[PDB]
Design a protein around this ligand. Structure first.
Ligand SMILES: *[C@@H]1O[C@H](CO)[C@@H](O[C@@H]2O[C@H](CO)[C@@H](O)[C@H](O)[C@H]2NC(C)=O)[C@H](O)[C@H]1NC(C)=O
Ligand SMILES: *[C@@H]1O[C@H](CO)[C@@H](O[C@@H]2O[C@H](CO)[C@@H](O)[C@H](O)[C@H]2NC(C)=O)[C@H](O)[C@H]1NC(C)=O
Ligand SMILES: Nc1nc(=O)c2ncn([C@@H]3O[C@H](CO)[C@H]4OP(=O)(O)O[C@H]43)c2[nH]1
Ligand SMILES: Nc1nc(=O)c2ncn([C@@H]3O[C@H](CO)[C@H]4OP(=O)(O)O[C@H]43)c2[nH]1
Ligand SMILES: *[C@@H]1O[C@H](CO)[C@@H](O)[C@H](O)[C@H]1NC(C)=O
Ligand SMILES: *[C@@H]1O[C@H](CO)[C@@H](O)[C@H](O)[C@H]1NC(C)=O
Ligand SMILES: *[C@@H]1O[C@H](CO)[C@@H](O)[C@H](O)[C@H]1NC(C)=O
Ligand SMILES: *[C@@H]1O[C@H](CO)[C@@H](O)[C@H](O)[C@H]1NC(C)=O
Ligand SMILES: *[C@@H]1O[C@H](CO)[C@@H](O)[C@H](O)[C@H]1NC(C)=O
Ligand SMILES: *[C@@H]1O[C@H](CO)[C@@H](O)[C@H](O)[C@H]1NC(C)=O
Ligand SMILES: *[C@@H]1O[C@H](CO)[C@@H](O)[C@H](O)[C@H]1NC(C)=O
Ligand SMILES: *[C@@H]1O[C@H](CO)[C@@H](O)[C@H](O)[C@H]1NC(C)=O
Ligand SMILES: *[C@@H]1O[C@H](CO)[C@@H](O)[C@H](O)[C@H]1NC(C)=O
Ligand SMILES: *[C@@H]1O[C@H](CO)[C@@H](O)[C@H](O)[C@H]1NC(C)=O
Ligand SMILES: *[C@@H]1O[C@H](CO)[C@@H](O)[C@H](O)[C@H]1NC(C)=O
Ligand SMILES: *[C@@H]1O[C@H](CO)[C@@H](O)[C@H](O)[C@H]1NC(C)=O
Ligand SMILES: *[C@@H]1O[C@H](CO)[C@@H](O)[C@H](O)[C@H]1NC(C)=O
Lengths: 776, 774
RNA sequence: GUCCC
RNA sequence: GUCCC
């Protein structure tokens, strides 16, 4: 098809509408800028490479560039690879950028630069120098940036990238940048708010610094500011997972009552880890529009019970008072001030880490009349006692989150309140809530449940009981009131499936997760009824992964409704022991089942009967990670609606003589990570239904035309070949040609479609291989 | 050293004292008997190979053979590999064995044989034909076995190896085998006890068959029999994990009351899975010496509460009544008959699977006066309630086993009572600390001191696999003043308090592995410094705890010798830039063994080694995805003897190992990405004794890297599964490997050339390189 | 590759 | 390969 092979080791995309030519060279182990980058190129990314220098030749031809992303070509020693340390900082020669008349955005983060690069064109709206070694800002070095709007200078002096001094900012350094909207000086060892900043600021990031005091006029002129983050100045250091130095005498960040008076526009204020003991209402006298307030990781436990400042926050959407507990105090209860009632607009309230023994209904009354409240997060509070029925007054809420507590009778990262910098950029780039009302009781100490535990909660759509201690012979009496429940996450418990009536009271249940309930499945002689499915009339999806199931009293699972079954990490090798026919029809009576996952079941072979016993509408089958050493391909004939076969991470050595003759229906075939050395002569002949084919990470040496007829290849959405053992002799002439000239999408042509030999061409990409010597 | 390279792909061992020459060819992907087997060869093993035939040429020279082990060269379809199925049964030509005048033992199990091989010498004392296809025994075929003593015929007709008919045994087939001691007809589809058997039998195995009835005189003459197993004839099939066909009418195996009268010598009687409802005392009227009785997997729940037969068993060492519960009955308590008191000799009692709600002290009184009782096993009973204090009356017992129950306020295989055949042949723990109370796999959520009142004598407590979610503060085990071993694994330790466990003042070993729960949620306080309070602790296991944070910065002990810290997140604690935890193990002054494998340590920040306590001998950094390693830093570890760096991504070795560590004896670098050795790698590294470089990508090895004055001290040197290039540059290496004394495993199997083309796939032991010397 | 798996 | 890990 193609007349001129694409040899450039970068992805190239046309966005014809927005007039853009996008060249992505992210992570291509480059040591030079590749030649032949299109002249029409507008967005060029060279992130994560080892190009040691930039020069006028770097971009000479590329006069249409609006964005260069040149991050992490020399990342500071402690942030970067220890196996591929950068030897010497990126060198930028003069005039490298002054040519680029249309350049709007320049990223040079993570290059060990000592100074703000000079000679930048006046077109530049965005400059980014995170994780460099620039810790002294001077007015003179900034004059070139007159039209700059966004400026990132953070992560240039902190514990992962130390500069061993205080950050220096000359007086009025930023004042003449009259268009500057966004200024980020986070994670920098700054000692004072730099002044005077231009009144044109919308966003100021000053977090994770050594600022002890805000002067009353530090933000005098900033009438346009929308976001201010002063977090992690005088930090709360208890249980900090980074080196943390508090302000002396447990001082807080000192903020004058009138510091915020100019900030009429402020929408987000962030005062996380500022060791605050008081929130003066006077702060918010002229901020009527504040929406998001973060007061997590302070010492505001007392204040939570007073909190006059809330009376001045009627438009607040989001409030975070997480982790304000006094060290070595375990409060009997939660004292929320009446003031919380004045938060007419509040959608999201979070108070993790108040740390209290017992939660009672009336303690939450300050919230009864917040009409817009969607999320209430009382996680990580070590609550021992809580009558769940209290939440009957909270039908309107989308999520009630009591995760990580000690109870017995819109998602946040695993590390969140204790990350150093949760917004920090990586070198790459730049859940049942949807079912309805969700009660998250995950990670508590619930050993035993009964119906009255759930009295008055019939409105729930999702209950999360993951990671409790539930060890009970559920018999269908325990969840009686949960008439609306669509989703139950019962993972990481100790289900005892003695009774086939387990869960049958949850009459509207669409999804059940009983994964990682392996305990009782590990002791011989225990009765388990896997036939419990029959009683669940609307169940769509069952997850029973990592249950180590090696026995069952019942011989068949039954459902008229079940569409998907995850059965990963069990012992079907033991149930289907060769010679024992009793369980070969375990899934057969799941008549509507379309998706089945029996990966990680130690199936080194499949006894005959397995495929005949599969239910008739099976579409999507995974046998991945089974250590399969053999596979009778013909047996795929029984699976008449099979569309996806995942056989990844096994030990298969062969493909079928003709895939067409094994399955007419099969569209996606995944054989990545096997031991295939060669393909059958007529492998894909007449396999007209085939659309996707992964042969990556095998040991294939040759591919001949017969195996891969073009009337199949040209239907394929994707064909993966990378990481094989290709031999680039004159016998590979067809394959090499076809790869060079095909339209078919083949990932990693630049990176890992490589010759292993013969010696001469070893390690050389096949896309670049010249084989003319074979045609004399 | 060696003048004639060993080219035979079999291990060869001299036992000079017993006059034996042992050749082991087990599992060497052979398709022929190798030539050059020594003539003096006495024991020859060819197990697990693909040799398709035996012939007079097979052993022609080997006239001094006493044992041929030729198992599993053609295993039946369903027992064998499905990826390397055997195409056609083993063919044994006539005269193959008649040469072998001294042959005592012959194993031909697992070869798909259709008939008992003929032509066997009269010297033969043991013949073994398990897992063949021989399901009709004829007197005529056995005449050749006149001097036979041990004869295995089992596993020739059962569900893994079906023959599709009943087993046939001609009348008196075994009678004229006048020396036969041991006969095994297990797992065979036998319908009746074959008669008449020779009176010379000591052991008869008839289990897992289709025997419905014992005739009163089936065992008439067997006055010498010691072991009888009739198990799995009319099996109890509830929750059986194999195809199980009960006798119709829920009938038991029918045993007439006088069936055993001749068996004065019987020591072991095994009646497991015989669907027995009664044990008539009359059975044991003439057996006073019975020692071991298995009555597991019957329906003897009622009988347990009567059990007059025990009055006739004063010499019984071992009794098993496990799994006798009536289906869908959950008894309130255990009714043991008074009769149990008469078992003066009983060392071991097992009653799993009685299935009852509550155990009370007095229910065990029938046992109070059994002086010799060592083991009491009440596992898998779904016991809801048990006052542990009752065991105060049982100080004398070595093990009290309450494992797999439902309690809250030798070792047996994982599958045991429900295996088909627990004795079946393959083709190839805190008990020792003293009194042990095994409470593993219960539902204990909360513990307090009174739970252990009166149990001060305990040496081992196993709480593994409970629900313990408690901020242990050192008050909970107060009474356990003697406890040497605590297994607290698979719980949910909340290490808030650094006084946890401190009351266990005699504790030598603590396992708190797989207590990861509270370690997975940010902002929770954990005191890893709890070790300080544990004055005699030798060994601490805290594996698979996913530990990524700690309030305290150092662990302290004067006593601790071994710390297992596998499966945690030291990569997070030691984040580059954060110096605070680099001395976590430094103050464990007597620590000799440390395991920090599986901690995702892709690199070691500088200071890790300086922070290691001074007497560290044995260090594992396996399975960390290490891509780089500053070998010089090994200088800090002055008493280092073992470094395990297996399963990582290392690409190089140090320029001189001698200049990194003088002390290092064992260096394990298996499963890395090493492509070459440094020029003078091992020069002067005289202390080195073990070196694993297996599963790397090494191409060449030169004499400079591997000087002979080091190599020849090595106990073991592993090289297998590398990328060796067998050009004329490899002349030295190839020569040295061929001629060295040094032990190198897998020379026959996986020390292979990958090239050049010509020599590809060829073993280096067999490589001829004369073309290099013209 | 006789039991485990 | 800046937050993670
Ligand atoms: C942040 O700046 C402080 C001081 O402003 C730096 O600390 C000084 O650094 C040197 C080397 O550690 C010491 O000898 C001085 O004693 C320090 N002075 C003070 C007052 O602490 C600190 O290193 C900087 N932090 C980072 C991570 O670069
Ligand atoms: C044990 O022997 C029985 C006969 O007692 C075998 O069962 C016969 O085999 C075929 C095929 O299964 C049936 O059509 C016959 O009717 C069976 N006969 C009877 C009397 O049932 C059985 O297959 C043998 N067992 C094994 C494991 O090989
Ligand atoms: N799984 C299970 N959990 C229990 O808590 C229980 N109590 C009695 N039983 C009985 O134990 C036998 C083996 O588990 C089961 O068979 P059953 O007699 O129907 O009744 C069962 C229990 N089984
Ligand atoms: N680990 C833990 N388990 C608890 O049960 C508990 N109750 C209160 N707390 C307090 O929560 C804080 C963070 O875990 C701990 O710090 P503390 O204030 O010393 O007291 C602790 C508990 N901590
Ligand atoms: C291309 O660059 C412009 C300006 O830097 C930017 O707004 C646009 O999103 C970029 N797109 C891509 C895909 O790089
Ligand atoms: C709650 O806290 C406030 C402010 O600290 C305190 O004054 C008040 O007495 C407390 N009220 C209750 C109900 O505990
Ligand atoms: C929980 O509170 C409800 C009121 O919603 C009440 O009916 C129920 O009895 C309470 N349960 C307990 C143990 O207090
Ligand atoms: C339940 O909570 C657990 C642990 O907090 C989390 O992994 C899981 O995603 C939650 N389940 C659902 C369905 O959202
Ligand atoms: C379940 O247990 C309840 C009470 O806990 C008992 O009353 C009943 O037998 C069981 N119900 C069903 C539907 O099996
Ligand atoms: C499940 O199987 C058992 C037999 O093992 C049967 O008694 C029970 O009622 C079955 N349950 C259903 C829902 O079919
Ligand atoms: C098939 O199922 C897997 C999970 O088992 C899923 O990730 C994949 O997207 C599915 N594909 C199709 C085409 O149904
Ligand atoms: C496979 O191929 C043969 C010959 O073309 C044909 O007879 C047979 O029906 C085919 N089976 C399928 C399922 O295509
Ligand atoms: C060698 O064969 C004899 C006879 O079968 C036996 O007693 C001895 O234990 C065997 N030794 C080995 C090492 O096979
Ligand atoms: C357990 O038994 C002991 C005596 O062995 C008694 O002192 C204690 O009170 C008992 N505990 C209970 C709850 O019965
Ligand atoms: C404790 O019991 C567990 C769980 O059954 C068992 O695996 C372990 O070996 C026992 N502990 C010790 C130290 O013997
Ligand atoms: C531990 O807690 C118990 C109560 O459960 C308390 O009585 C005891 O004094 C505490 N011990 C220590 C060492 O703090
Ligand atoms: C452990 O360290 C903590 C402070 O981090 C301290 O409270 C406690 O005294 C220490 N405990 C021991 C036993 O050293």
């Amino acid at each position: 098809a193609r007349w001129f092979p694409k040899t450039l080791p970068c992805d190239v995309t046309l966005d014809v509408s927005k007039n853009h030519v996008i060249v992505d060279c992210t992570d291509k182990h480059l040591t030079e800028i590749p030649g032949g980058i299109p002249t029409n190129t507008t967005n060029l990314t060279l992130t994560i490479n080892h190009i040691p220098d930039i020069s006028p030749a770097s971009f000479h031809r590329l006069v249409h560039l609006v964005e260069i992303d040149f991050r992490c070509n020399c990342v500071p020693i402690r942030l970067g690879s220890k196996s591929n340390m950068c030897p010497r900082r990126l060198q930028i020669k003069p005039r490298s950028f002054s040519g680029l008349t249309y350049l709007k955005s320049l990223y040079l983060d993570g290059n060990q630069l000592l100074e703000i690069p000079q000679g930048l064109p006046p077109s530049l709206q965005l400059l980014s120098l995170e994780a460099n070694n620039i810790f002294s800002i001077r007015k003179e070095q900034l004059t070139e940036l007159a039209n700059i709007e966004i400026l990132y200078l953070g992560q240039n002096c902190y514990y992962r990238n130390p500069c061993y001094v205080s950050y220096s900012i000359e007086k009025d350094a930023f004042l003449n940048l009259t268009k500057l909207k966004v200024l980020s000086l986070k994670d920098n060892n700054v000692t004072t708010v730099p002044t005077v900043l231009p009144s044109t600021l919308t966003e100021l990031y000053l977090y994770n610094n050594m600022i002890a005091e805000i002067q009353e006029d530090d933000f005098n002129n900033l009438n346009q500011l929308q976001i201010l983050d002063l977090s992690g100045n005088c930090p709360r250091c208890y249980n900090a997972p980074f080196p943390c130095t508090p302000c002396k005498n447990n001082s807080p960040l000192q903020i004058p009552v009138n510091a915020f008076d100019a900030l009429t526009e402020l929408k987000v204020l962030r005062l996380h880890s500022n060791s605050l003991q008081h929130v003066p209402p006077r702060w918010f006298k002229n901020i009527n529009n504040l929406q998001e307030l973060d007061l997590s990781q302070n010492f505001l436990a007392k204040e939570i019970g007073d909190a006059k400042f809330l009376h001045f926050l009627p438009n607040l959407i989001q409030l975070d008072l997480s982790f304000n507990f006094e060290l070595q105090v375990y409060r009997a209860s939660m004292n929320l001030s009446q003031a919380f009632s004045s938060l007419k607009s509040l959608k999201i309230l979070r108070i993790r880490g108040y740390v209290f023994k017992e939660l009672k209904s009336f303690q939450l009354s300050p919230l009864h009349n917040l009409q817009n409240l969607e999320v209430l997060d009382l996680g990580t509070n070590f609550i021992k006692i809580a009558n769940l029925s209290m939440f009957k007054q909270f039908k309107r809420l989308k999520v009630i989150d009591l995760s990580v507590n000690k109870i017995s009778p819109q998602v946040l990262e695993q590390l969140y309140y204790f990350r150093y910098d949760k917004y920090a950029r990586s070198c790459r780039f730049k859940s049942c809530y949807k079912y309805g009302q969700t009660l998250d009781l995950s990670k508590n100490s619930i050993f035993f449940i009964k119906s009255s535990d759930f009295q008055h909660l019939s409105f729930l759509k999702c209950l999360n009981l993951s990671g409790n201690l539930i060890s009970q012979t559920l018999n269908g009496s325990e969840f009686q009131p949960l008439a609306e429940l669509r989703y139950l996450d019962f993972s990481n418990n100790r289900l005892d499936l003695l009774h086939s009536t387990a869960f049958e009271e949850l009459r509207k249940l669409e999804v059940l997760d009983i994964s990682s309930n392996s305990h009782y499945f590990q002791s011989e002689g225990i009765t388990h009824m896997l036939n419990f499915t029959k009683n669940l009339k609307v169940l769509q999806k069952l997850m029973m992964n990592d249950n180590d199931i090696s026995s069952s009293t019942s011989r068949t699972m039954e459902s008229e409704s079940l569409r998907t079954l995850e059965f990963r990490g069990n012992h079907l090798d033991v149930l289907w022991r060769d010679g024992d026919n009793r369980y070969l029809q375990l899934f057969k009576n799941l008549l509507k089942l379309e998706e089945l996952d029996i990966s990680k079941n130690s199936l080194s072979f499949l006894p005959s009967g397995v495929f005949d016993g599969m239910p008739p509408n099976l579409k999507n089958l995974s046998l991945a990670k089974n250590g399969l050493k053999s596979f009778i391909w013909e047996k795929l004939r029984y699976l008449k609606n099979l569309e996806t076969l995942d056989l990844s991470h096994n030990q298969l050595t062969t493909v079928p003589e003709r895939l067409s003759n094994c399955s007419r229906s099969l569209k996606n075939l995944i054989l990545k990570n096997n031991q295939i050395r060669s393909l059958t002569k007529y492998f894909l002949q007449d396999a007209f239904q085939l659309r996707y084919l992964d042969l990556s990470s095998n040991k294939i040496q040759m591919i001949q035309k017969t195996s891969f007829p073009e009337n199949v290849l040209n239907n394929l959405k994707m064909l993966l070949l990378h990481h094989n053992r290709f031999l680039c002799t004159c016998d590979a002439v067809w394959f090499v040609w076809w790869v060079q000239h095909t339209e078919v999408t083949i990932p990693y042509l630049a990176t890992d479609v490589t010759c292993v030999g013969p010696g001469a061409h070893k390690g050389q990409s096949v896309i670049s291989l010249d084989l003319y010597t074979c045609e004399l």
